[PDB]
Amino acid sequence: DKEAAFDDAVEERVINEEYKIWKKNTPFLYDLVMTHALEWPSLTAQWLPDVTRPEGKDFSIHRLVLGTHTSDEQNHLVIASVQLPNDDAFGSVSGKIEIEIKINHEGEVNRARYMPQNPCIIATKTPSSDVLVFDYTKHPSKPDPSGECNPDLRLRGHQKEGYGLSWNPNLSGHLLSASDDHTICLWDISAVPKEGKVVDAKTIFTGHTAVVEDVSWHLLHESLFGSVADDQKLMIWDTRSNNTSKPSHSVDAHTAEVNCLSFNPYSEFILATGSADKTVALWDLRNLKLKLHSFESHKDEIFQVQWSPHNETILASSGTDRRLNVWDLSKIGEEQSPEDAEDGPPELLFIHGGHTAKISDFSWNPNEPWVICSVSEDNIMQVWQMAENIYN
Amino acid sequence: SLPRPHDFFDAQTLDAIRHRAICFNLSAHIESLGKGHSVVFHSTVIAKRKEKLLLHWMPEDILPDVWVNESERHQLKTKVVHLSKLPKDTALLLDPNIYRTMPQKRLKR
Amino acid sequence: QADHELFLQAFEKPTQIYRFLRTRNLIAPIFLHRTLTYMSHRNSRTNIKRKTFKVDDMLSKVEKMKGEQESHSHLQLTTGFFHVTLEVLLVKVCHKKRKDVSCPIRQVPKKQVPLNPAVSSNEFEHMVKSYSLLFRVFVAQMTVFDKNRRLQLLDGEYEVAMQEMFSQGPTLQFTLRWTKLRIFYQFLYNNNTRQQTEARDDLHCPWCTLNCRKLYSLLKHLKLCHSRFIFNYVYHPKGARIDVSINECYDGSYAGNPQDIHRQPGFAFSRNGPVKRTPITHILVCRPKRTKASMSEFLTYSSGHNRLYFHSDTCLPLRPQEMEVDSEDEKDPEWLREKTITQIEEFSDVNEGEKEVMKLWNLHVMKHGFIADNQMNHACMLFVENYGQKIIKKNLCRNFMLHLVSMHDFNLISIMSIDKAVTKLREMQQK
Amino acid sequence: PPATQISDLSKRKPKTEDFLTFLCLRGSPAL
């Protein structure tokens, strides 16, 4: 409709003005705020664990595993280096978010989850039904102007596109992926024969009627992992159950489509699930039926929830609302002043509004306390750190 | 001096915003009766609970109808509620551009 | 006068923008104002983040489940209408899924009411957000449960009024049962038209209606959030006089992809699919000092391409795809070639074949850009490598030999070069 | 009491039927 187009234009103007206002207040809201406009939009982001601290230099170098989203050109699996001001003081050090590696990739990258037991191996989700387990060390630094070279591994167990990609921390390898075919397939990988061409699914899970939006492994037990789907039913699957159809737990957990999921790094029972109901709800694995506090301040879908690795009571959510909200779980229920109540719930700690488009993905840097890299569909990557005064 | 950066709002968006503001001030009385930060809704009795009274406020599809006694109805025939406390589910109806998903489109996830 | 009208418009544009932003942010905030350092007056609660999150389940179970109170608990319905059979249908409005634009409503249901003189099942049970009953005679809708499942539709006499297509209009009766700191603003435009006001609510943002409890916080909020103006504090004998003027510069152009700033309508700000753009890196906050608050305050770095470029020839926007190549400035512009051809052909004292060979040589030299005498030698060979067929077809081989002789007489080339060039020309004819 | 800032802003953004009259309908322009 023409009215819809006029409203979209007005909203674009308002979004630009809001971004300008936010950037005016960026010094008073963040300690570090670095915005980089990637050549191609990225649908994924995950800091590599390795960090380099050059002696005599005021900064440090971290590695980001970014994807690519080309309209028709050759998609890539970008790996870039980011310079962070470390503890004290940089003014001008030339390139700060320059790329390091670029491996050719058939189709846009949907996920860039590296293998934790070996950050050399990085997996990727293609628009096709097959997942590719790259190895950026083996591949050439510069991209070969040809087709998608042999990724050293290509697992095909799905029937359509997928978005979930979970790496087992307790077991080396074990990349489990959930696709739109209502199937969450698990590939053993790792202990597999060399000369990687095709890797069949070790076990495929069909217990979610709708399209499984995402899936994550349990951070303590190697036999447990949660899967969340569009049927509004977050399921916690237990391996070695002699059945690949009935999950151990089948809590509905939401009303609208539930997209993301992330276990608490510290607690062995706390997990968060963001959904299309504009609600990020915490959960306890001790009792499945009962629901914990439901963080409700988003105005659109919650596409990604990720607990902070440096804190046990901090969780961040983002999605189509174009806002990145940081929640302090230990602040839930605290009495607030009327101005504080007007600003937002006591649980909510910070709202990042530097993105003019939907946040495709975000991640924390394990080597830094409170810095987050969030990539939007506007081909914008922002590495930002919340101001110290917010969290003492 | 420095060149004029060609302000992005222009006049068409300004005209639409002026129209929306005029409608908002005529409907919710935000400027006059809302003290600049609240919506002044006027309730209307619809049904009588003979066991309270059900009242519906003038800006429709914003706040649910509630049951109030006759004395309560007389006391609160008009309700002023701050924008912060508006129900998040239906608060967006106060203006088309209060929050609009810019990429409506299709495909994506 | 027209000066006041111009002032009113020039202040109304940013005032209207900021008033809309005020009405929008209170429901859709750009950021939490309590998280702004200059707005530290709010967020009146310290950090007690020293309690484990593994006992939240027990705390919530004890608080809610242990002390659970029943929210509520068939329905009995029956009097007459006023101003005819009417239909009573139970409407169940479902939750708004991503696929659905609006919340779906499924109407699961007649009685012969008097012309202006029912026992319901356990259909309630939760995909449906709430349960409502709709009456049509002349329509009437009433909800039985709220968002929190609040027990509405109280049992007893109910004179539920109806809206055409209690009250004076057509109403229906039914029986329901079970089973100081004065702050002054002096708006100034062109230093000639001034409007002096005074804030109705002290220490409150006139635009955003925000409660800045301190004068420094209010001034900083004005300078930052409402940046379309410039706020020059001047102090007042009674309170504070905040002069307000329109920010002359206010670089507030489009901040997205520079390509969209020049696309044709219908494709600008399309957001439909991924769009390539030139890489750029910006650093806004690196490590701010975080100095103490003081009123004395009221007495950036970028790497990469940070604009939209244009073609030097057509003055049209330059796409990122057409950037890494096509420097678009090469040795021999087409206009120079045409001018050389015209100047050669415009001579009076020259033969036709002589002019043709002269133009061919000039075009070849421009296309290759010889500047060195020794290269001239190889240049001659290059000529027969590119213009040999054309000269042969034009049958100007003798003129080419004459040109070679003249060039040798002008130094550069040599007798051996002349013989080699002629032999290369002959091999073309034999082929 | 030279008017009020909120009243001046409300006399600035709307200038039509929904102007609430009051002092805005009075000699607001040209002081």
Coordinates of all heavy atoms in Angstrom, one line a residue, chain B residues 13-87, unseen atoms left out:
Chain B
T13 N 8.3 14.9 5.1 CA 8.3 14.2 6.4 C 7.9 15.1 7.5 O 7.2 14.7 8.4 CB 9.7 13.6 6.7
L14 N 8.3 16.4 7.4 CA 7.9 17.4 8.4 C 6.4 17.6 8.3 O 5.7 17.7 9.3 CB 8.6 18.7 8.2
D15 N 5.8 17.6 7.1 CA 4.4 17.8 7.0 C 3.6 16.6 7.5 O 2.6 16.8 8.2 CB 4.0 18.0 5.5
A16 N 4.1 15.4 7.3 CA 3.5 14.2 7.8 C 3.5 14.2 9.4 O 2.6 13.9 10.0 CB 4.1 12.9 7.3
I17 N 4.7 14.6 9.9 CA 4.8 14.7 11.4 C 3.9 15.7 12.0 O 3.3 15.6 13.0 CB 6.3 15.0 11.8
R18 N 3.7 16.9 11.3 CA 2.8 17.9 11.7 C 1.4 17.4 11.7 O 0.6 17.7 12.7 CB 3.0 19.2 10.9 CG 1.8 20.1 10.9 CD 2.2 21.5 10.9 NE 2.6 22.0 9.6 CZ 3.9 22.1 9.2 NH1 4.9 21.9 10.1 NH2 4.2 22.5 8.0
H19 N 1.0 16.7 10.7 CA -0.3 16.1 10.6 C -0.6 15.1 11.8 O -1.6 15.2 12.4 CB -0.6 15.4 9.3 CG -1.5 14.2 9.4 ND1 -2.8 14.3 9.5 CD2 -1.1 12.9 9.4 CE1 -3.3 13.1 9.5 NE2 -2.3 12.2 9.5
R20 N 0.4 14.2 12.0 CA 0.3 13.3 13.1 C 0.2 14.0 14.4 O -0.6 13.5 15.3 CB 1.5 12.3 13.0
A21 N 1.0 15.0 14.6 CA 1.0 15.7 15.9 C -0.3 16.5 16.1 O -0.9 16.5 17.2 CB 2.1 16.7 15.9
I22 N -0.9 17.0 15.0 CA -2.2 17.7 15.1 C -3.3 16.7 15.5 O -4.1 16.9 16.4 CB -2.6 18.4 13.8 CG1 -1.8 19.7 13.7 CG2 -4.0 18.7 13.7 CD1 -2.1 20.4 12.4
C23 N -3.3 15.5 14.9 CA -4.2 14.4 15.2 C -4.0 14.0 16.7 O -5.0 13.8 17.4 CB -4.1 13.3 14.3 SG -4.8 13.5 12.6
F24 N -2.8 13.8 17.1 CA -2.5 13.4 18.5 C -3.0 14.4 19.5 O -3.6 14.1 20.5 CB -1.0 13.1 18.6 CG -0.7 12.2 19.8 CD1 -1.1 10.9 19.8 CD2 0.0 12.7 20.8 CE1 -0.8 10.0 20.8 CE2 0.3 11.8 21.9 CZ -0.1 10.5 21.9
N25 N -2.8 15.7 19.2 CA -3.2 16.7 20.1 C -4.7 16.9 20.2 O -5.3 17.2 21.2 CB -2.5 18.1 19.8
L26 N -5.4 16.6 19.0 CA -6.8 16.7 19.0 C -7.5 15.4 19.6 O -8.6 15.5 20.1 CB -7.3 16.8 17.6
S27 N -6.8 14.3 19.7 CA -7.3 13.1 20.2 C -7.0 12.8 21.7 O -7.9 12.8 22.5 CB -6.9 11.9 19.4 OG -6.9 10.7 20.1
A28 N -5.7 12.7 22.0 CA -5.3 12.4 23.3 C -5.0 13.6 24.2 O -4.8 13.4 25.4 CB -4.0 11.5 23.3
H29 N -5.0 14.8 23.7 CA -4.8 16.0 24.5 C -3.5 15.9 25.2 O -3.4 16.3 26.4 CB -6.0 16.3 25.4 CG -7.3 16.1 24.8 ND1 -8.0 17.2 24.3 CD2 -8.1 15.0 24.6 CE1 -9.2 16.8 23.8 NE2 -9.2 15.4 24.0
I30 N -2.4 15.4 24.6 CA -1.1 15.3 25.2 C -0.6 16.6 25.6 O 0.0 16.8 26.7 CB -0.2 14.5 24.3
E31 N -0.7 17.6 24.7 CA -0.1 18.9 25.0 C -0.8 19.7 26.1 O -0.2 20.2 27.0 CB 0.0 19.7 23.7
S32 N -2.1 19.7 26.0 CA -2.9 20.6 26.9 C -3.2 19.8 28.2 O -2.7 20.2 29.3 CB -4.2 21.0 26.3 OG -5.2 20.1 26.4
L33 N -3.9 18.7 28.1 CA -4.4 18.0 29.3 C -3.4 16.9 29.8 O -3.5 16.5 31.0 CB -5.8 17.4 29.1
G34 N -2.5 16.5 28.9 CA -1.5 15.5 29.3 C -0.2 16.0 29.9 O 0.7 15.2 30.1
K35 N -0.2 17.3 30.1 CA 1.0 18.0 30.7 C 2.3 17.7 29.8 O 3.4 17.8 30.3 CB 1.3 17.5 32.1
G36 N 2.1 17.4 28.5 CA 3.2 17.2 27.6 C 3.8 15.8 27.7 O 4.6 15.5 26.9
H37 N 3.3 14.9 28.6 CA 3.9 13.6 28.7 C 2.8 12.5 29.0 O 3.2 11.4 29.3 CB 4.9 13.6 29.8 CG 4.4 14.1 31.1 ND1 3.4 13.6 31.8 CD2 4.8 15.2 31.9 CE1 3.2 14.2 32.9 NE2 4.0 15.3 33.0
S38 N 1.5 12.8 28.8 CA 0.5 11.8 29.1 C -0.6 11.9 28.1 O -0.8 12.9 27.5 CB 0.0 12.0 30.6 OG 1.1 11.8 31.5
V39 N -1.4 10.9 28.1 CA -2.6 10.8 27.2 C -3.8 10.9 28.1 O -4.0 10.1 29.0 CB -2.6 9.5 26.4
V40 N -4.7 11.9 27.8 CA -5.9 12.2 28.6 C -7.1 11.5 27.8 O -7.6 12.0 26.9 CB -6.2 13.7 28.7
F41 N -7.4 10.3 28.3 CA -8.5 9.5 27.8 C -9.8 9.7 28.5 O -9.8 9.9 29.8 CB -8.2 8.0 27.7
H42 N -10.9 9.8 27.8 CA -12.2 10.0 28.4 C -13.0 8.7 28.3 O -13.2 8.1 27.2 CB -13.0 11.1 27.7 CG -12.1 12.3 27.4 ND1 -11.7 13.2 28.3 CD2 -11.6 12.7 26.2 CE1 -11.0 14.1 27.7 NE2 -10.8 13.8 26.4
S43 N -13.5 8.2 29.4 CA -14.2 6.9 29.5 C -15.7 7.1 29.2 O -16.2 8.2 29.3 CB -14.0 6.2 30.9 OG -14.7 7.0 31.9
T44 N -16.4 6.0 28.8 CA -17.8 6.1 28.6 C -18.4 4.8 29.1 O -17.9 3.7 28.7 CB -18.1 6.2 27.1
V45 N -19.5 4.9 29.9 CA -20.1 3.7 30.4 C -20.8 2.9 29.3 O -21.5 3.5 28.4 CB -21.1 4.1 31.5
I46 N -20.6 1.6 29.3 CA -21.2 0.7 28.3 C -22.2 -0.3 29.0 O -23.3 -0.5 28.5 CB -20.1 0.0 27.5
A47 N -21.7 -1.0 30.0 CA -22.5 -2.0 30.7 C -22.5 -1.7 32.2 O -21.6 -1.2 32.7 CB -22.1 -3.4 30.4
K48 N -23.6 -2.2 32.9 CA -23.7 -2.1 34.3 C -23.7 -3.5 34.9 O -24.4 -4.3 34.5 CB -25.0 -1.3 34.7
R49 N -22.8 -3.7 35.9 CA -22.6 -4.9 36.6 C -23.4 -4.8 37.9 O -22.9 -4.3 38.9 CB -21.2 -5.3 36.9
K50 N -24.7 -5.3 37.9 CA -25.5 -5.3 39.1 C -25.4 -6.7 39.7 O -26.0 -7.7 39.3 CB -27.0 -5.0 38.7
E51 N -24.6 -6.8 40.8 CA -24.4 -8.0 41.5 C -25.1 -8.0 42.9 O -25.6 -6.9 43.3 CB -22.9 -8.3 41.7
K52 N -20.7 -2.9 39.6 CA -19.8 -1.9 38.9 C -20.4 -1.5 37.6 O -21.5 -1.9 37.2 CB -18.4 -2.5 38.8
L53 N -19.6 -0.8 36.8 CA -19.9 -0.4 35.5 C -18.7 -0.5 34.6 O -17.6 -0.1 34.9 CB -20.4 1.1 35.4
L54 N -18.9 -1.0 33.3 CA -17.8 -1.1 32.4 C -17.7 0.2 31.6 O -18.7 0.7 31.1 CB -18.1 -2.3 31.4
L55 N -16.5 0.7 31.5 CA -16.2 2.0 30.8 C -15.1 1.8 29.8 O -14.1 1.1 30.0 CB -15.7 3.0 31.8
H56 N -15.4 2.4 28.6 CA -14.4 2.3 27.5 C -13.9 3.7 27.2 O -14.7 4.7 27.1 CB -15.1 1.8 26.2
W57 N -12.6 3.9 27.1 CA -12.0 5.2 26.9 C -12.0 5.6 25.5 O -12.1 4.8 24.5 CB -10.6 5.1 27.5 CG -10.5 5.2 29.0 CD1 -10.5 6.3 29.7 CD2 -10.5 4.1 29.9 NE1 -10.5 6.0 31.1 CE2 -10.5 4.6 31.2 CE3 -10.6 2.7 29.7 CZ2 -10.5 3.8 32.3 CZ3 -10.6 1.9 30.8 CH2 -10.5 2.4 32.1
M58 N -12.0 7.0 25.3 CA -12.2 7.5 24.0 C -11.2 7.1 22.9 O -11.6 6.7 21.8 CB -12.3 9.1 24.1
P59 N -9.9 7.1 23.2 CA -9.0 6.5 22.2 C -9.1 5.0 22.2 O -8.6 4.4 23.1 CB -7.6 7.0 22.6 CG -7.9 8.2 23.5 CD -9.1 7.8 24.2
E60 N -9.7 4.4 21.2 CA -10.0 3.0 21.2 C -8.8 2.2 20.9 O -7.8 2.6 20.4 CB -11.1 2.7 20.1
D61 N -8.8 0.9 21.4 CA -7.8 -0.1 21.2 C -6.4 0.4 21.8 O -5.4 0.2 21.2 CB -7.6 -0.4 19.7
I62 N -6.5 1.1 22.9 CA -5.3 1.5 23.7 C -5.3 0.9 25.1 O -4.3 0.3 25.4 CB -5.3 3.1 23.8
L63 N -6.4 1.0 25.8 CA -6.5 0.4 27.1 C -7.8 -0.4 27.2 O -8.8 0.0 26.7 CB -6.5 1.5 28.2
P64 N -7.7 -1.5 27.9 CA -8.9 -2.4 28.0 C -10.0 -1.7 28.8 O -9.7 -1.0 29.7 CB -8.4 -3.7 28.6 CG -7.2 -3.2 29.4 CD -6.6 -2.1 28.7
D65 N -11.2 -2.1 28.5 CA -12.4 -1.7 29.3 C -12.3 -2.3 30.7 O -12.0 -3.5 30.8 CB -13.7 -2.0 28.6
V66 N -12.6 -1.5 31.7 CA -12.5 -1.9 33.1 C -13.9 -1.7 33.8 O -14.7 -1.0 33.4 CB -11.4 -1.1 33.8
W67 N -14.0 -2.5 34.9 CA -15.2 -2.4 35.7 C -15.0 -1.5 36.9 O -14.1 -1.7 37.7 CB -15.6 -3.8 36.2 CG -16.1 -4.8 35.1 CD1 -15.4 -5.8 34.6 CD2 -17.4 -4.7 34.5 NE1 -16.2 -6.4 33.6 CE2 -17.4 -5.8 33.6 CE3 -18.5 -4.0 34.6 CZ2 -18.5 -6.1 32.8 CZ3 -19.6 -4.2 33.8 CH2 -19.6 -5.3 32.9
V68 N -15.9 -0.5 37.0 CA -15.8 0.5 38.0 C -17.1 0.8 38.6 O -18.1 0.8 37.9 CB -15.1 1.9 37.5
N69 N -17.2 1.0 39.9 CA -18.4 1.3 40.6 C -18.9 2.7 40.2 O -18.2 3.5 39.6 CB -18.2 1.2 42.1
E70 N -20.2 2.9 40.5 CA -20.8 4.2 40.1 C -20.1 5.4 40.7 O -19.8 6.4 40.0 CB -22.3 4.2 40.5
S71 N -19.7 5.3 42.0 CA -18.9 6.4 42.6 C -17.5 6.4 41.9 O -17.0 7.4 41.6 CB -18.7 6.1 44.1
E72 N -16.9 5.2 41.7 CA -15.7 5.1 41.0 C -15.8 5.7 39.6 O -14.9 6.3 39.1 CB -15.1 3.7 40.9
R73 N -16.9 5.4 38.9 CA -17.1 5.9 37.5 C -17.2 7.4 37.5 O -16.6 8.1 36.7 CB -18.3 5.3 36.9
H74 N -17.9 8.0 38.5 CA -18.0 9.4 38.6 C -16.6 10.0 38.9 O -16.2 11.1 38.4 CB -19.0 9.8 39.7
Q75 N -15.8 9.4 39.8 CA -14.5 9.9 40.1 C -13.5 9.8 38.9 O -12.8 10.8 38.7 CB -13.9 9.1 41.3
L76 N -13.6 8.8 38.1 CA -12.6 8.5 37.1 C -13.3 8.4 35.7 O -13.0 7.6 34.9 CB -11.8 7.2 37.4
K77 N -14.2 9.3 35.5 CA -14.8 9.5 34.1 C -13.7 9.8 33.1 O -13.8 9.5 31.9 CB -15.9 10.5 34.1
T78 N -12.7 10.5 33.5 CA -11.5 10.9 32.7 C -10.2 10.4 33.3 O -10.0 10.7 34.5 CB -11.5 12.4 32.4 OG1 -12.4 12.7 31.4 CG2 -10.1 12.8 31.9
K79 N -9.4 9.7 32.6 CA -8.2 9.1 33.1 C -7.0 9.7 32.3 O -7.0 9.7 31.1 CB -8.2 7.6 33.0 CG -6.8 6.9 33.0 CD -6.8 5.6 32.4 CE -7.2 4.5 33.3 NZ -6.2 4.4 34.5
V80 N -6.0 10.1 33.1 CA -4.7 10.6 32.5 C -3.6 9.6 32.8 O -3.4 9.3 34.0 CB -4.4 12.0 33.0 CG1 -3.0 12.3 32.6 CG2 -5.4 13.0 32.4
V81 N -3.0 9.0 31.8 CA -2.0 8.0 32.0 C -0.7 8.4 31.3 O -0.8 8.8 30.1 CB -2.5 6.6 31.6 CG1 -3.1 6.7 30.2 CG2 -1.3 5.6 31.6
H82 N 0.4 8.3 31.9 CA 1.7 8.6 31.3 C 2.1 7.6 30.2 O 1.7 6.4 30.2 CB 2.8 8.6 32.4 CG 4.1 9.3 31.9 ND1 5.1 8.7 31.2 CD2 4.5 10.6 32.0 CE1 6.0 9.6 30.9 NE2 5.7 10.7 31.4
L83 N 2.8 8.1 29.2 CA 3.1 7.3 28.0 C 4.0 6.1 28.4 O 4.0 5.0 27.8 CB 3.9 8.1 27.0 CG 3.0 9.2 26.3 CD1 3.9 10.0 25.4 CD2 1.9 8.5 25.4
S84 N 4.8 6.2 29.5 CA 5.6 5.1 30.0 C 4.8 3.9 30.4 O 5.2 2.8 30.2 CB 6.6 5.6 31.1
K85 N 3.7 4.2 31.1 CA 2.9 3.2 31.6 C 1.8 2.6 30.7 O 1.0 1.8 31.0 CB 2.2 3.7 32.9
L86 N 1.8 3.1 29.4 CA 0.9 2.6 28.4 C 1.1 1.2 28.2 O 2.3 0.7 28.2 CB 1.0 3.5 27.1 CG -0.2 4.4 26.9 CD1 -0.4 5.3 28.1 CD2 0.2 5.3 25.6
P87 N 0.1 0.4 27.9 CA 0.3 -1.1 27.6 C 1.2 -1.2 26.3 O 0.8 -0.7 25.2 CB -1.1 -1.6 27.4 CG -2.0 -0.6 28.1 CD -1.3 0.7 27.9

